Amino acid sequence: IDPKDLTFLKELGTGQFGVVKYGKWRGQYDVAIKMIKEGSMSEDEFIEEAKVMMNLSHEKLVQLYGVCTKQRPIFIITEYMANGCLLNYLREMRHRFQTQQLLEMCKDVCEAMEYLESKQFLHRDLAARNCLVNDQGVVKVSDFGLSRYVLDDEYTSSVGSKFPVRWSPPEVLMYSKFSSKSDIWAFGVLMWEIYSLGKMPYERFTNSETAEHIAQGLRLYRPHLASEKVYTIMYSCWHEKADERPTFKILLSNILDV
Amino acid sequence: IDPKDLTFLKELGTGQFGVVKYGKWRGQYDVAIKMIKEGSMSEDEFIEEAKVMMNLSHEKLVQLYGVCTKQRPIFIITEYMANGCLLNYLREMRHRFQTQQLLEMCKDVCEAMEYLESKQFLHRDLAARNCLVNDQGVVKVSDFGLSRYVLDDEYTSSVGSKFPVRWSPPEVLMYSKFSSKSDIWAFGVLMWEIYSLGKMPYERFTNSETAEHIAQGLRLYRPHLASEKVYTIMYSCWHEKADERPTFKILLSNILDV
């Protein structure tokens, strides 16, 4: 797909596969190049997923411009985000953050998650680490792709694994019950990450300890920067009964009038 | 611990935790700084494994210098390797090798592996992608960070996410039974990678067909740049019956004999 030759300057780092560099595609589009390894991925494996992900377009989703559908480290080309990942942004030196802009971030993410919701597309791993910020301060969700879809009512996929845990519903922390409502739980933790200015969820807990506590009733406390209403919103995402959880559509409305 | 008395440069090697970056340490030690991430993994956790890794040392093992687990993002500095990973090395400008350079590389890796074996430390992910090459052309094995210094000879794990199936023996393919002989198998495949000049194992297969292929007792074909003798040593690594697969000391003695 992507004409393998384009401008290239430095690199960025890593997300879910390998090294992501930087360059200019079509002499007008700034891009980040996601590299794999010619010993795992292939032009025949992701062709399906590539087309499907390109079906995902929204100003709040980091866009996949194209992929080098050939063989060797797959040179996938995405939207260059000048300010890096949200996690590093929140902790930014000069913490000049007002609740006004803090909420805007939750809004940018919610809009993106809202359209993914509508499009019936699960993110699987929603967290501030998987969100990028561009030169304008706009937060857009990325690291989606191998992120699941849905079918009759659920699935299984890779049996046995290590999930992020903190951003996961008690359902998944035990028998990996991923659903439309799984991303909802993680979105609340993300909101928490936002109002926490980068604070890692469940700090002072281990993964095994965090897992046991969520089931018993343990939840995230209100961050000093969040208002009572903002805490209500993020907390609606954590009902152990997935059915009682709101949609990104509702989550979007409530956020718009806080 | 390590006070950040480093500078900054550019892109570098990767690992399942992430990529690394360039800098100089305590005068003139070229280092590649890897991130473990923010909060996710805590200072206390890595401390043990850090002590354990720094106790490892062989000129054919990429050395860990220190840990910068200073609350915020945990960093690790390993020795910088100018030519990058062996996989990239095998395909790039250096492509024009000779059997002499191919066997030398297998020896470098077998020297580092024999050493790990004597220290009961297993490398659960040996592949060409995990080896790095310095400016002298020396090949060193890396990314054995998460690897386990298993006290007991039989090893059990947690497992999930995905598996580098193309370098795994059937008992790892079936229930993650890693041991010394699991590395031997993976090393044997690495040899096939060296000799086929950086080609991916079973590229027309899928992770599932590869498992079926191995289940039939079939392995990786003799590459045109390997003698019947060189093929005999790598082929031994894939015996199926774990106890019929040679030790790294024997493999190294085989390699030397020529």
For the record, the CATH architecture of the largest domain in chain A stands as: Orthogonal Bundle
Total helices of chain A: the number is 8
Largest interface: A-B, 29 and 30 residues
Largest sheet of chain A: 5 strands, antiparallel
Number of strands of chain A: 7
- How many domains is the backbone of chain A divided into? 2
Q: In sequence order, what are the helices and strands of chain A, one letter per element?
A: EEEHEEHHEEHHHHH
Oligomer: homodimer
Strand content of chain A: 5-15%
> What would you call the shape of chain A?
globular
Which homologous superfamily in CATH is the superfamily of the largest domain in chain A?
A: Transferase(Phosphotransferase) domain 1
Radius of gyration of chain A: 18 Å
Query: Which structural class best describes the helix and strand composition of chain A?
Result: alpha+beta
Strand line-up in the sheet with most strands of chain A: 1-2-3-5-4
| Gap between N and C termini of chain A | 44 Å
- Give the helix level of chain A as a range of percent: 25-40%
Assigned CATH class of the largest domain in chain A:
Mainly Alpha
- Remind me, CATH topology of the largest domain in chain A? Transferase(Phosphotransferase), domain 1
Modified residues (Phosphotyrosine) (chains A, B): 155, 221
Binding site for clofedanol (chains A, B): 78-81, 146
Subcellular location (chains A, B): Cytoplasm; Cell membrane; Nucleus; Membrane raft
GO molecular function (chains A, B): ATP binding; identical protein binding; non-membrane spanning protein tyrosine kinase activity; phosphatidylinositol-3,4,5-trisphosphate binding; phospholipase activator activity; phospholipase binding; protein tyrosine kinase activity; zinc ion binding
